[PDB]
Design a protein around this ligand. Structure first.
Ligand SMILES: CCCCCCCCOCCOCCOCCOCCO
Ligand SMILES: CCCCCCCCOCCOCCOCCOCCO
Ligand SMILES: CCCCCCCCOCCOCCOCCOCCO
Ligand SMILES: CCCCCCCCOCCOCCOCCOCCO
Ligand SMILES: CCCCCCCCOCCOCCOCCOCCO
Ligand SMILES: CCCCCCCCOCCOCCOCCOCCO
Ligand SMILES: CCCCCCCCOCCOCCOCCOCCO
Ligand SMILES: CCCCCCCCOCCOCCOCCOCCO
Ligand SMILES: CCCCCCCCOCCOCCOCCOCCO
Lengths: 289, 289, 289
């Protein structure tokens, strides 16, 4: 069985003083298509393979290709995946909760380097023999994530640095907790990174949360993000502040709104200020299909 | 929702004295696949994204990729599209009416340079930041087309030449009229091009038409194409003559036939003579799926 | 009509002393997706086009593209195909019968060079104007195969070497026979190769066969492969020995098993020894979807 799903997104992307002789405002857009093949068995074991084909404005050669395959096996709530895997630090809950705008960005996101699913090919050739193994599992309302990423599996292992990550999250109906930890993240030796986050649903309509991170060898240092959102019908308002230890950094912040036009259609915008005083703004749509 | 459609075509392509040590006759063939994702809303607004994957004999690396995305929004007969758009000069009716053979070619087609939907990637990198906006609408039996193409939207606009085009066509059951006009076509400054055409369905089986063009800065000069077709059951006969102002040019002409073998299957051939006395012939099939 | 099918495979691939500073054991995996468009007619003629998108671990740029199109026409048991065709030497029965392991390999396979369907693009550019014509037909339980492959159809034919192949196989319920012959195989002048094979189903569960080959200009010389398999429920045991004329070559051999876990799911392994004493082992899964 083969199924196809994905999403399109387009709108305006403003970056104050982008560059000498550059336009600050552009039309940014993304097409994402996923090809999924699955084999269900009567034994209860499911086999799967996924490929992504992603295009973004500005991409080299005005063309689209697929990425590197991901394969998995699922049985009784346990999923083992091989190849281009989702990593633990990139999959836990709460870590991307401050993202806003139609491009889902936030300076409140972790300012570290770590491996994550690769959406596209990489012309530099660095991903050619990259191969990860991942394992996910769910006890009660607990989600467990584990991932092992080998940047070049053909080369003797004593010569390459492997990335290892673990994460768990948990949620009842009002509190959410999450934590992750990865060593040698992004294959950078000694770049050990951590995350702890918690959220409180103080209503059917509002939630506040707080994320803390150890950014490893990044120049950002430790970081804290405080965010909150509130829904008024089909409209959601979101905001966040974030600080990093880097001397002289500014406080980053953002304010945005989401409007659920229809099932599968979402109009979003935001105005954000980064740690180096960058001003960024956006407004556009996402539709899922 | 994701749907796939497209077509295959193959047959013989003859070019008299193609080149020293080249074969005049080859097997030319094309595979075109379109991936379309759509999101229908109960509000009446439809969202869409399309990608094309096209392969042609002789293509570099013996491979296929997708092109650059096209996105659109439709509401009440109005469609706005962004990215790799169809342009006004390329979409009006009647402008390609003389095309024949299984490759749908004609020297009677406009001999100018103008932007059009890009089927494939471009290795030269010229299309990397190309971005168009297009708008179509239909009053009675009137079709209105408008398009704005920015060859490099990241660069300050005072440095790049944008293409702007408008077109309309109209048809009752016997007369057809169409006109288009585009300035700085193909991003060439001062290359303003125009088209006017008209057709007369003098029967259920026969039609005659005439197309005139201002080819802008091309060396062809103004051009006139006179064509006609006539259907005998599943068989269609077509012919056209065309002249350009270029001194010493020959009159171009073509004669071909189409045979509708089955729904979705069409066998075509033609013999054409160009403006520089080139002799070209073809015979093959197209099937849609 | 467009349909999608394919398969995923993953597991461990061991090559004794692969290379200085290389890992002998890797995770090898393959994702194959086929896109097939067909047009059925009421006349009985079917038109088809196929494209493949294949990714393998270690592939350049960590990406996937499609290959070169294949087109065909089928009528009354006769199929003519154009472009990236299956060749006669690569399609006859019995020639790959000794293949085992989850990667379906065998040193008992023919050690010659010959054209075959191209799965992927080729960066070297050698396949750019490659074009084959193929014809298959089936009398009783007879299968007839014919193929003509032109490595560069744009160039004058007196300058290029074309590959021509024929094959037939036949089977009742217990004996199988097959033979093939191709001249200038792989476009190498004078590299004429041949194959004869026969198999005996000495049970519902067991089969023994023997394949002989003239490897043309290869350094292997003539070759003989003797193989056998036997099924015990969902488990299949397979083995083969193979010899080549090359002086000092070793006898190659392999032993493996296949376990049919479920419809569409197959777990395989093997231990093989090549003609130069190479030791290779594998274990993994294949699932079809
Ligand atoms: C500002 C640089 C020049 C680009 C022209 C800006 C014109 C804006 O777009 C007009 C046509 O519509 C498409 C743009 O996508 C963004 C629209 O807002 C998203 C839906 O709420
Ligand atoms: C990103 C999708 C893959 C498409 C990119 C292929 C890149 C090919 O170019 C690599 C650079 O070398 C130049 C190639 O020669 C011409 C390419 O093909 C011609 C028709 O579009
Ligand atoms: C300056 C060039 C144009 C690009 C900028 C578009 C940025 C537009 O503003 C972003 C949206 O601001 C969100 C407001 O926060 C309040 C939310 O509730 C109000 C509307 O539903
Ligand atoms: C002329 C150069 C060498 C190529 C051989 C020409 C042989 C013609 O094709 C024979 C096999 O069939 C496939 C060709 O596609 C064209 C057939 O006509 C189209 C359907 O009406
Ligand atoms: C046109 C479809 C895209 C496929 C073209 C990829 C072009 C890659 O080559 C660019 C030129 O540089 C050489 C690349 O190194 C080898 C490529 O991949 C090997 C297996 O086929
Ligand atoms: C010379 C190498 C072969 C390639 C050339 C094939 C060209 C064949 O002729 C094209 C078809 O000619 C069309 C004829 O116009 C009359 C139409 O009605 C008659 C048949 O239905
Ligand atoms: C040996 C080099 C380092 C690679 C680690 C080997 C660990 C083996 O895999 C553990 C995780 O599972 C995925 C591997 O695919 C092969 C499993 O066997 C196939 C099914 O029978
Ligand atoms: C194999 C699938 C096709 C993808 C390969 C495209 C190969 C492009 O590189 C050719 C070598 O030249 C370097 C290209 O410049 C950067 C590429 O695109 C950037 C984003 O991934
Ligand atoms: C040495 C690193 C690991 C990689 C090697 C895996 C190789 C494993 O063995 C292959 C399977 O051997 C097949 C045995 O033949 C007997 C068949 O019946 C028994 C089991 O069903």
């Amino acid at each position: 069985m083969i199924s196809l799903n994905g999403y399109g997104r387009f709108g305006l992307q403003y970056v104050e003083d982008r560059g000498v002789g550059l336009e600050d405002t552009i039309i940014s857009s993304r097409l994402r298509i996923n090809i999924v093949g699955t084999t269900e068995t009567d034994q209860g074991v499911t086999f799967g393979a996924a490929l992504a084909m992603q295009w973004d404005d500005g991409d080299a050669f005005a063309g689209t290709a697929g990425n590197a395959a991901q394969f998995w096996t699922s049985y009784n709530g346990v999923t083992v995946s091989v190849g281009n895997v989702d990593t633990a630090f990139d999959s836990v809950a709460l870590t991307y909760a401050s993202a806003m705008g139609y491009e889902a960005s936030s300076f409140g996101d972790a300012q570290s380097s770590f491996f994550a699913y690769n959406s596209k090919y990489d012309a530099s050739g660095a991903l050619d023999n990259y191969n990860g193994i991942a394992v996910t599992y769910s006890i009660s309302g607990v989600n467990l994530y584990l991932s092992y990423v080998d940047p070049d599996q053909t080369v003797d292992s004593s010569l390459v640095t492997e990335e290892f990550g673990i994460a768990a999250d948990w949620s009842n109906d009002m509190i959410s907790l999450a934590a992750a930890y990865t060593t040698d993240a992004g294959g950078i030796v000694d770049n050990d990174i951590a995350f702890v986050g918690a959220a409180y649903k103080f209503n059917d309509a509002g939630t506040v949360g707080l994320n803390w991170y150890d950014n490893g060898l990044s120049t950002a240092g430790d970081q804290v993000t405080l965010y909150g959102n509130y829904a008024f019908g089909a409209t959601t308002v979101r905001a966040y502040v974030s600080d990093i230890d880097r001397a002289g950094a500014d406080t980053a912040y953002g304010i945005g709104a989401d409007y659920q036009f229809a099932e599968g259609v979402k109009v979003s915008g935001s105005v954000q200020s980064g740690f180096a005083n960058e001003t960024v703004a956006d407004v556009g749509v996402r539709f899922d299909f």
